[PDB]
């Protein structure tokens, strides 16, 4: 009766859901955007933009 899940869960803090960003996939999207910001930051790659 156990069910392996590939992502992480935390159960319901409250029954009135409202927005937070302190979770795993918004964390992941934030790091991917941080890389792409760093990539556009480094000028040796593109001199054209």
């Amino acid at each position: 009766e156990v069910l392996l899940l590939p992502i992480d869960h935390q159960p319901a803090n409250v029954t009135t859901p409202t927005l937070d960003f302190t979770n795993e996939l918004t964390n992941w999207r934030a790091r991917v955007c941080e890389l792409m910001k760093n990539l556009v930051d480094n000028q040796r790659y593109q001199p054209g933009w």
């Binding site: 593109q46 001199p47 054209g48 933009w49």
Partner: protein, 49 residues
């Protein structure tokens, strides 16, 4: 007026990094094919170093 400077440098860098199988063709396969062809000629090869 510096936009043409930037677009020039970007066009240069991207034109440097276009993909083309032609140089490795010339560097690996074309002399092999050319050597396979070279005896099957009415006009046999005649070179000056």
């Amino acid at each position: 007026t510096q936009s043409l400077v930037s677009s020039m440098r970007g066009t240069l860098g991207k034109l440097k990094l276009i993909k083309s199988m032609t140089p490795m063709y010339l560097q690996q396969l074309a002399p092999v094919e050319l050597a396979v062809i070279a005896p099957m000629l009415p006009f046999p090869p005649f070179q000056v170093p």
